[PDB]
Symmetry: C4
Subunit: 388 residues, 4 copies
Amino acid sequence: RNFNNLTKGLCTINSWHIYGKDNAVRIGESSDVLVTREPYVSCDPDECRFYALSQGTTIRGKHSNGTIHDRSQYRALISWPLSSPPTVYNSRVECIGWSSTSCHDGKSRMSICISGPNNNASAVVWYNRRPVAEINTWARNILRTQESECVCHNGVCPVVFTDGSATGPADTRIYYFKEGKILKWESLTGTAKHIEECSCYGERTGITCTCRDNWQGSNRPVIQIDPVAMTHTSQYICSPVLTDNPRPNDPNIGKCNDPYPGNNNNGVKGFSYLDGANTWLGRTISTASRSGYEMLKVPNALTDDRSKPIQGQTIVLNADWSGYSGSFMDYWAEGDCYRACFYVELIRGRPKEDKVWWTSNSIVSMCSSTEFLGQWNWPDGAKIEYFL
Amino acid sequence: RNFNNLTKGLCTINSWHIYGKDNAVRIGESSDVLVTREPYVSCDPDECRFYALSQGTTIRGKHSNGTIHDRSQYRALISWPLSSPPTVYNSRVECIGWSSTSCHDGKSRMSICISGPNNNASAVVWYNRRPVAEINTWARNILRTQESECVCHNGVCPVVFTDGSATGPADTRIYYFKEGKILKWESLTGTAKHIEECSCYGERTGITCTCRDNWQGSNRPVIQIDPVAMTHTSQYICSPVLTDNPRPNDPNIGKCNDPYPGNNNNGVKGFSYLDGANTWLGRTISTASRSGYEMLKVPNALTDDRSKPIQGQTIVLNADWSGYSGSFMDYWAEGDCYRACFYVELIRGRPKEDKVWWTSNSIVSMCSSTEFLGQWNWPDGAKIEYFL
Amino acid sequence: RNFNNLTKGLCTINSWHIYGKDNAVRIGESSDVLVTREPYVSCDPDECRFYALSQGTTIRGKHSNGTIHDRSQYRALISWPLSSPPTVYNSRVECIGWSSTSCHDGKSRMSICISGPNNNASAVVWYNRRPVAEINTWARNILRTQESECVCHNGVCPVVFTDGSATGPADTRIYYFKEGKILKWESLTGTAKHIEECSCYGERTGITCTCRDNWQGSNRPVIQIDPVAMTHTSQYICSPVLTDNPRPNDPNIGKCNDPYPGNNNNGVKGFSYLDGANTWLGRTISTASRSGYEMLKVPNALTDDRSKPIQGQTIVLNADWSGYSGSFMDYWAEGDCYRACFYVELIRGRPKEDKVWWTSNSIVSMCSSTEFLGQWNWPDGAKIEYFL
Amino acid sequence: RNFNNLTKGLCTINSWHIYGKDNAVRIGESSDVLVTREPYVSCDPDECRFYALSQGTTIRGKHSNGTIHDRSQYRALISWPLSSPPTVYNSRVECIGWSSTSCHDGKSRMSICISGPNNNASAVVWYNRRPVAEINTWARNILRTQESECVCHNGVCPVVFTDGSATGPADTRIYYFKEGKILKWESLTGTAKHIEECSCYGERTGITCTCRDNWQGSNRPVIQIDPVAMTHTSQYICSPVLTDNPRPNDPNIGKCNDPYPGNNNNGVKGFSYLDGANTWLGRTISTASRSGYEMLKVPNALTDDRSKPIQGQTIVLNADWSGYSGSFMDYWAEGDCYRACFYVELIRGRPKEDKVWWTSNSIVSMCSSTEFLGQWNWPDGAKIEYFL
Ligand SMILES: *[C@@H]1O[C@H](CO)[C@@H](O[C@@H]2O[C@H](CO)[C@@H](O[C@@H]3O[C@H](CO[C@H]4O[C@H](CO[C@H]5O[C@H](CO)[C@@H](O)[C@H](O)[C@@H]5O)[C@@H](O)[C@H](O[C@H]5O[C@H](CO)[C@@H](O)[C@H](O)[C@@H]5O)[C@@H]4O)[C@@H](O)[C@H](O[C@H]4O[C@H](CO)[C@@H](O)[C@H](O)[C@@H]4O[C@H]4O[C@H](CO)[C@@H](O)[C@H](O)[C@@H]4O[C@H]4O[C@H](CO)[C@@H](O)[C@H](O)[C@@H]4O)[C@@H]3O)[C@H](O)[C@H]2NC(C)=O)[C@H](O)[C@H]1NC(C)=O
Ligand SMILES: *[C@@H]1O[C@H](CO)[C@@H](O[C@@H]2O[C@H](CO)[C@@H](O[C@@H]3O[C@H](CO[C@H]4O[C@H](CO[C@H]5O[C@H](CO)[C@@H](O)[C@H](O)[C@@H]5O)[C@@H](O)[C@H](O[C@H]5O[C@H](CO)[C@@H](O)[C@H](O)[C@@H]5O)[C@@H]4O)[C@@H](O)[C@H](O[C@H]4O[C@H](CO)[C@@H](O)[C@H](O)[C@@H]4O[C@H]4O[C@H](CO)[C@@H](O)[C@H](O)[C@@H]4O[C@H]4O[C@H](CO)[C@@H](O)[C@H](O)[C@@H]4O)[C@@H]3O)[C@H](O)[C@H]2NC(C)=O)[C@H](O)[C@H]1NC(C)=O
Ligand SMILES: *[C@@H]1O[C@H](CO)[C@@H](O[C@@H]2O[C@H](CO)[C@@H](O[C@@H]3O[C@H](CO[C@H]4O[C@H](CO[C@H]5O[C@H](CO)[C@@H](O)[C@H](O)[C@@H]5O)[C@@H](O)[C@H](O[C@H]5O[C@H](CO)[C@@H](O)[C@H](O)[C@@H]5O)[C@@H]4O)[C@@H](O)[C@H](O[C@H]4O[C@H](CO)[C@@H](O)[C@H](O)[C@@H]4O[C@H]4O[C@H](CO)[C@@H](O)[C@H](O)[C@@H]4O[C@H]4O[C@H](CO)[C@@H](O)[C@H](O)[C@@H]4O)[C@@H]3O)[C@H](O)[C@H]2NC(C)=O)[C@H](O)[C@H]1NC(C)=O
Ligand SMILES: *[C@@H]1O[C@H](CO)[C@@H](O[C@@H]2O[C@H](CO)[C@@H](O[C@@H]3O[C@H](CO[C@H]4O[C@H](CO[C@H]5O[C@H](CO)[C@@H](O)[C@H](O)[C@@H]5O)[C@@H](O)[C@H](O[C@H]5O[C@H](CO)[C@@H](O)[C@H](O)[C@@H]5O)[C@@H]4O)[C@@H](O)[C@H](O[C@H]4O[C@H](CO)[C@@H](O)[C@H](O)[C@@H]4O[C@H]4O[C@H](CO)[C@@H](O)[C@H](O)[C@@H]4O[C@H]4O[C@H](CO)[C@@H](O)[C@H](O)[C@@H]4O)[C@@H]3O)[C@H](O)[C@H]2NC(C)=O)[C@H](O)[C@H]1NC(C)=O
Ligand SMILES: CCC(CC)O[C@@H]1C=C(C(=O)O)C[C@H](N)[C@H]1NC(C)=O
Ligand SMILES: CCC(CC)O[C@@H]1C=C(C(=O)O)C[C@H](N)[C@H]1NC(C)=O
Ligand SMILES: CCC(CC)O[C@@H]1C=C(C(=O)O)C[C@H](N)[C@H]1NC(C)=O
Ligand SMILES: [Ca+2]
Ligand SMILES: [Ca+2]
Ligand SMILES: [Ca+2]
Ligand SMILES: [Ca+2]
């Protein structure tokens, strides 16, 4: 087997087709389905799987009580077959912790999980299902990482980490791993002022990450990584089509090098594909809460501070709960281009649905089509009253 | 591995032997068994599996309430090991949607699922577990396909699709795929006046599909496909042994080129093996409802409008519920001939059993024997009262 | 891969060690464990598995009600990993039916299941997980077979079948299969007067089967099969140590060529290893019912009508329920000899425990040791009151 | 494949990172999780798995009542995927019995299970999933072994056994196996006065086992084994940092060649890594009961009767229940050194929590880091009240 190289461009995105959906909460009403949050999708050369942070209990289990909590000793990164739900009997534990990323380099998979108390957290880097390297907290304030897949080129897999305040200046680092070993790390440079939960994808130009400014900005920070030189730059998406949540209404001029103001100390993990005229942005439909999800085609969104949508597709209706979203691609698929994909976390339970005492989610995922396909909407589909 | 070629004739059919049965509803009374409908069977070169459309809930789950509904966002084509039931923990999702077909070409499996609202549905074609091609609705009225396996020759896999009215003239197309890519499609030609849910099988002469005229006819439409030239013809089974349900009583003269009248705007998916003197037809025993199932040997049924049975075999008693039926064969079996097989969907719950709020099914399947074997009958076997 | 040849003798049997035990009824009190009966054990070249006839329901399921019944459309031969219980999610269906045998020939596994009504039953012979040959009833009275593994030599696998009365003269046949095809069959010859449920094992001398005379005899019939010439002989175990159940007390002179009288129209499946001075017989401890199990070393039991035990080992206490027993060996194990093994079916529920409405079992199995090992006893271990 | 050779030293231990945790009791509150005790961890060349002694029932099952009991016919050594819980559907039975060890030699795995009544117990040695050799009790008083993994060098796998009194002089033997065959055994020599439940690890110097003196000593006995010459020596850990439980308070002078007095007729399975200045000892935090767990760096603990800690790490808070602990390493990992690992059994239920009628456990495991990582604490995490 050989290391995968990023040698293709993105396929032209004219619409999005359904890729996967696990209906986990519906099924977990009467099955041994693990409580999760922070899901994602990641491909091996022979298989694509769903990933998430388990809470170490099933939904019907009494220990689901209190699972709105983020960081406990009972969490772990699990993976399971595409569009199956995460069950006790089919979920594979990748590592123990409450913040994670994972990616295949063409030869083997690297998985990273962070665990610990707020002031003493540490990352363990697994490669080919064995622990290889460990990284101690550098700011002693919740060391944390992407919550979606990383991307590799010629064996080098960059990962974005943050340690420090979630509502002020923090210490973000980009690490470059190979076979789980640390080749290099560097402090964040560029004009992004705060970085959380980067969603990344790779193509021939390099690796692109769209992140979450949890401090002052409702536009999204972008980090662009050269995996060969192992260097990066950062800025914001220039477009006035703002894609964080909550957020102000869309103005007519965006901000390329500073946070767009109006909403502070909150946000949601999200993603974009930035590819000139082939640029598509994801966002919640609501500006106030994690409900709805849409994709909008916004030409040159990265660089054009006047850019507006010329096409779009509704993924989840505003009436339905959404949540985290992130990017992934099947780098091992046949063809001359990489087909853009994404997932949306469909959060059920607390805080928005507090008649139950748990918080969990299901997953919906889509990939791009060169056809102009009809659109549906894709809700979680569970009836909360059934759990009372 | 090589593409499979259709190089054999059908084995002589002198009776039918039990092949598989999953007892899904019996088991699902007290196990995590997925609610399904529209099942079928399809073989890989190394394994044969059951397939069906899950409803994204177990039978005992509260979300089974309302599963008489056909098209929701919570459906998916799943597959699972022969004669096991479709459980949450053993079912593999092939793709997301509410109408499907699937077949192995000798090298890899193609699966097609259609999803969307009635006026904006789209098919995604998967090959070797990856999405490859997409087809948007052409008539904007429930794009839909076979609900049983397709058949391949030298890598070419024809599939029958319909889009448009289910009770009037519609737009039927035959698509020819190879490795999931569209080689060609063509509009339906011939004398069949309406096409739904084709059940197909292949042999050296070509591919034969027996379908459902949901409009005016109670005889079944037949499409005969040449997978090399990628062309087809269509007509009806000429025999006065009528095999749709509901249906008029058997007359003494059938219709080769037009619907046999008496019952409109309904029908059921079914199948036949049309092979001269080796011809066998399947049908429900009842002329009014989906109950019972029998196989009847009717020589030259395809071409002889006077043909009557000379032999038969009861599969399911008239006292027991049946449902959809379709054809499949193990093209990779040893020997000088292809052994004809079929499945019968045994529907339980609504609309016929409305004391429960769900609709599901189990599966029974048979293959042909050159012996004259004794016959049994094969009911679903669940006691509905247990679910109250 | 090559066909296995029977080239070794039996290992010297000085005691028996625990081999496997699934505790199925204990576990099935609170797990999705299938109701079964008629279990056995059979080895592949790379794995050994438990086998049994499922009743198509779990024990806690309401459909377990009435499972004392022998022959329904909901039964199937299943196999599952050694010492695991037969669960809905781990059991592999081998074929559909209510009487079975199975064995590996070194290259692939043959499995045979019989299904049908009493007067029209038929066997389907599966080889390498595909149906290959079918055999219709010849006496129209419950065609039936071994209920434990068959044995193969150089690809030839003999199987004993009976069709006809269970309480009078019947039509027993020995079939010789290769790759699932019928090479030959022959009517029973020799002095055995009635044959049921043969337990067989192979070694360099040939294949030895110990069966159940359900008509007049409480000594066990023996069939000795030459798998090369494809011929056989039959007689009874000469020893006055009688091993059927129920049975008279042990006399001082046995019967080699006729049934030992006293008990009619009943019996139980059992086994023996007949190997000169290395001869061991299994039997229930009770002479009246299926309770207890012991192994007794009885030199030349096959040929010596005065032979008595010189050593023994208790397997299950008389206070605990037993049931069917049969032989198997791991023909693919390392060494210069074949290690004798057996299983005992531990029946729980009806008819003996009628406070529950079901009948099921667990399995215990042992293999021989050349050491003189201490003995334990091995009960099913479930508390029936827990199921009320 | 080749036999593994112990050719490396231990990696430098500067802290411990989380390796695995199954949260079994939390999950088993509402899932089919087997009741267990005496767990451990052991690696194959391609996978690492959790191991334990099942009680042949799930926790929610009524048969969990009375599982404080040590030795029944319903126990078996099971293994299951790393950090998954031991479920009915994912647990693989290695052998039947109530005391065990297991290890991979580089080619195949050897597993040993002991079963029987107190006065007639016997060990069966499995190699490559087949029984190979058997060992009868020599002292007729609960033949018993390590309860954690053994270690192999060039195919030779030493195992420590004890037979006889648990509260007085007993007959301890060291057996040397290869491919499951007994190469040699020898009676215990050296100054250790009583040996139970040895935890072992291997490196280039040889095999080191830290055991439990259940008779008079609260310091731990050590057996050092040369797997090439197949000889051993024994003594105690000289350090006054006492590591058995219960135990006296730490004095300032330890005992190298006799039990340190104060606590009699009790103890707990534990472990240490004895490696000069790289020496780390594990122990419960409490001196009275199995609660808490800590690792302490104690230079030359084996040989220095004045040695005290210079570094440490809390694993489980004193407020939380612990239990057995033992050593294992991934001998097949990449690198120039063996990374020390261990597990801690987290016992829940009886005797300490008697509002429930069962006794079970979950597992936490750690490996060493050359970094100085922040520490967390790792409780079982189940709420006992949920089970009432
Ligand atoms: C079957 O399926 C198919 C396939 O899905 C369905 O077809 C799809 O239909 C949907 C729904 O209509 C479309 O999505 C919308 O797309 C438009 C963009 O396309 C329009 O505008 C284009 C650009 O026009 C501008 O430039 C051109 C020059 O290039 C110039 O000529 C023009 O005058 C103008 O200057 C047009 O090019 C385009 O026309 C083309 O396409 C037409 C079909 O759509 C076709 O008919 C034409 O002939 C031509 O070919 C078209 O006019 C998006 O603008 C829109 O997204 C906005 O609206 C939705 C609500 O619906 C909202 O959620 C979005 O967030 C967004 O609106 C917010 O953001 C804006 C930007 O900041 C802002 O300006 C808005 O005020 C609004 O802001 C508010 O809400 C947000 C979100 O909550 C909040 O954050 C803000 O603060 C604020 O509160 C949709 O994405 C698909 O594109 C279309 N697909 C295809 C292939 O056709 C079909 O309908 C289905 N059939 C059936 C029967 O159902
Ligand atoms: C153990 O197992 C074995 C193996 O399964 C069992 O043996 C089987 O038994 C079953 C049940 O009897 C048989 O199925 C029936 O087969 C007959 C056809 O065979 C008969 O007719 C043949 C043709 O005769 C015609 O042509 C010949 C010239 O070739 C001429 O000589 C003759 O006079 C006539 O002109 C005969 O050749 C054949 O004889 C042969 O076989 C005999 C054994 O069967 C043997 O004894 C003979 O010696 C000779 O070898 C035999 O006479 C089918 O006609 C029949 O199917 C009809 O009836 C069932 C109800 O039972 C119904 O459900 C079917 O739909 C069908 O009847 C409907 O359709 C007809 C056609 O339109 C119509 O005319 C009817 O009025 C009826 O229509 C009504 O109902 C339908 C359905 O609801 C509705 O849609 C309509 O609108 C309307 O309301 C059976 O399939 C097996 O063939 C047989 N198998 C074997 C190998 O023998 C055995 O019984 C078991 N043993 C025990 C102890 O149980
Ligand atoms: C730790 O574990 C070890 C290993 O398991 C335990 O040791 C085992 O202990 C058990 C239980 O005692 C033994 O099983 C019994 O074996 C005897 C046979 O061995 C005895 O007899 C031998 C033959 O003697 C005859 O020939 C010799 C010449 O060769 C001659 O010298 C002699 O006088 C006589 O003529 C002796 O050779 C043998 O001695 C040897 O072994 C001794 C140890 O056992 C040793 O001490 C000696 O020094 C010497 O080495 C020994 O005396 C079986 O006969 C017996 O089976 C019968 O009894 C049980 C009930 O216990 C019953 O269930 C059986 O069915 C059977 O009895 C029925 O059938 C008989 C035959 O028809 C009939 O005659 C009986 O009347 C009876 O029939 C009634 O019941 C049946 C069944 O319900 C019914 O069908 C009938 O109709 C009727 O109602 C046991 O199998 C093991 O052999 C022994 N193993 C070893 C390796 O030692 C040890 O105990 C454990 N330790 C502890 C502390 O627990
Ligand atoms: C983020 O995470 C990091 C990483 O985990 C955290 O840092 C860790 O913090 C923990 C907790 O403090 C430390 O564990 C303790 O380690 C000490 C040993 O280190 C101390 O002592 C060393 C030796 O000093 C001696 O020799 C030197 C010469 O070499 C001489 O100079 C000195 O004067 C003295 O003679 C020092 O070298 C060492 O200093 C170094 O490290 C310091 C950081 O720790 C640093 O600040 C210094 O600059 C320098 O670099 C340090 O002083 C252990 O002694 C201790 O274990 C004892 O105490 C715990 C309770 O806390 C107890 O459970 C243990 O069992 C043990 O105490 C029992 O046993 C003793 C031995 O018999 C006995 O003497 C005690 O009385 C006691 O006995 C009683 O209890 C037991 C158990 O119940 C019972 O059996 C008895 O009968 C009796 O009842 C801890 O293990 C880590 O080492 C440290 N790790 C690192 C890398 O720094 C950090 O805190 C986290 N951050 C935050 C914000 O939370
Ligand atoms: C601690 C900062 C971080 C980013 C803003 O908070 C998160 C936001 C959450 C959210 O906004 O839904 C859920 C996360 N699991 C969480 N990460 C951790 C490690 O707890
Ligand atoms: C929409 C037309 C179509 C064919 C008549 O209806 C079907 C008949 C059904 C039936 O007659 O049982 C069930 C089907 N799942 C269905 N197909 C879809 C896509 O909903
Ligand atoms: C029909 C005769 C046969 C042998 C005596 O009866 C059996 C005895 C039984 C028994 O004695 O327990 C159970 C069997 N499952 C059964 N076989 C069939 C095919 O029903
Ligand atoms: Ca923000
Ligand atoms: Ca019709
Ligand atoms: Ca009898
Ligand atoms: Ca002690």
